[PDB]
Amino acid sequence: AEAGITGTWYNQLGSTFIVTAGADGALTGTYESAVGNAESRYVLTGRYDSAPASGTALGWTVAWKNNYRNAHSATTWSGQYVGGAEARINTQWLLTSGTTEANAWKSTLVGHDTFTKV
Amino acid sequence: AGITGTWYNQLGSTFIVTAGADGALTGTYESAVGNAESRYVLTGRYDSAPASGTALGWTVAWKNNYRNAHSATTWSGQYVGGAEARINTQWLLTSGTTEANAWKSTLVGHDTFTKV
Amino acid sequence: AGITGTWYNQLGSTFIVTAGADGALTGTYESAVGNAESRYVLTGRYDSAPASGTALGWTVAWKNNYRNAHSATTWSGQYVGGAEARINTQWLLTSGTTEANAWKSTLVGHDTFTKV
Amino acid sequence: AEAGITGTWYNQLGSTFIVTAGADGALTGTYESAVGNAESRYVLTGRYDSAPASGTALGWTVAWKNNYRNAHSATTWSGQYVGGAEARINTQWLLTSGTTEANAWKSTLVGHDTFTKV
């Protein structure tokens, strides 16, 4: 929940996700990545189910552009928050890169990330 | 400017968005499926300084004042401007589930948005 | 019968398949992309006793007598027969990579096959 | 390789994959599933890179129909074989169910399976 989700998380790559869950279902924070043509932090925005039933559905987006670099790509993570002892966020993600129309067919990667809460 | 406006997917859903100078996407989404009749809030990000399509994404949690589906969809794609502007995406829809049903909680698909 | 035949995707690739009574799919795929000019073997499965589309899938490893891309694509979808028959799919393309590049080894997409 | 891939594997759900890798790049075997509207074994067919460079690219399909049941669906696994001490097959999969044209938009699931060799 609000409290549940809010905090600092890390994924299997060593990436850092700092998030605040608002009462209106908003997610806002920053993402600090370990891989790609990256550097420094990036702004994230998302939504979550503020009135869950076991898991809490959520998703967020990161556009890989900050004041220092631009990779012309964006990633969206879709998954669920599972509270308890070992609170975790289990996700599947899609990374799309800006391409020409000829290359569009191979513009999207798919993967999975597991986040653990500090 | 180009992204800002009203769009529609193949299902007939309506995506009304405002693109900020800074890279933010804000707006509302009115579904023609799953089961709705109502609008939902959406939030996202986009490359505000593109190179040729413009990368973007947004999320919608399927909960409003009237109903709660306990699910969320994320769209990831690119905006291709011109005379016949389009937003080409691939999406992931995840439902809240018990751990036993977790293996099959996510659906994958593709949507094409146009201004008509 | 219906599935057996010659099909084409949006890229112009050619899919020649034979559907067995038993559920097997066998054939050849000639790519119009990535970078080819040549054919590759394909193998798959299909529901040989459908209920309304017919579920199927097949894999192509991108290695023939001439080249080796060290990759493979799997297509998963459904055949929808009628006057204007189609095969609607979603695909995964995985390249062999070092463990360090493993996170980004798979591309996702969608293809539509028709008889024209 | 042929020898590398050939054998018995299990995934995180307790499913069993028995496979034989042919010299011509063919994969043939049987799959025995722990989840779904399933029972008994099902035939699998696939292809793999018979002349790899680190990982070996491969993929296979299962149509969920045997002499005992039919769920009118098929799954395709795409991934790589990584040899060594802890030989594993890392995959991403797509499961499509036969549906009417109205429901086609929500006909496909996406997930990930990790196979360990006995």
Ligand SMILES: O=C(O)c1ccccc1/N=N/c1ccc(O)c2ccccc12
């Ligand atoms: O970092 C993660 O945890 C991460 C997790 C899941 C998917 C992608 C990720 N990272 N993606 C990038 C990070 C930094 C960059 O400069 C990039 C440049 C181009 C494309 C992707 C990236």
Ligand SMILES: O=C(O)c1ccccc1/N=N/c1ccc(O)c2ccccc12
């Ligand atoms: O609407 C689209 O254009 C749409 C486009 C892509 C993916 C999903 C979509 N819609 N999904 C739902 C809409 C309304 C609901 O109440 C739901 C309840 C449970 C799961 C999904 C939905």
Ligand SMILES: O=C(O)c1ccccc1/N=N/c1ccc(O)c2ccccc12
């Ligand atoms: O051809 C299609 O219709 C096609 C359709 C969907 C997905 C992939 C495809 N083709 N992919 C390749 C074709 C030829 C190659 O040498 C490759 C080398 C590396 C990676 C992919 C390919």
Ligand SMILES: O=C(O)c1ccccc1/N=N/c1ccc(O)c2ccccc12
């Ligand atoms: O079993 C795995 O390891 C498995 C792993 C990945 C994806 C799917 C799986 N299993 N899928 C089914 C198994 C048995 C069934 O009767 C089904 C009926 C309908 C849809 C899926 C299945």
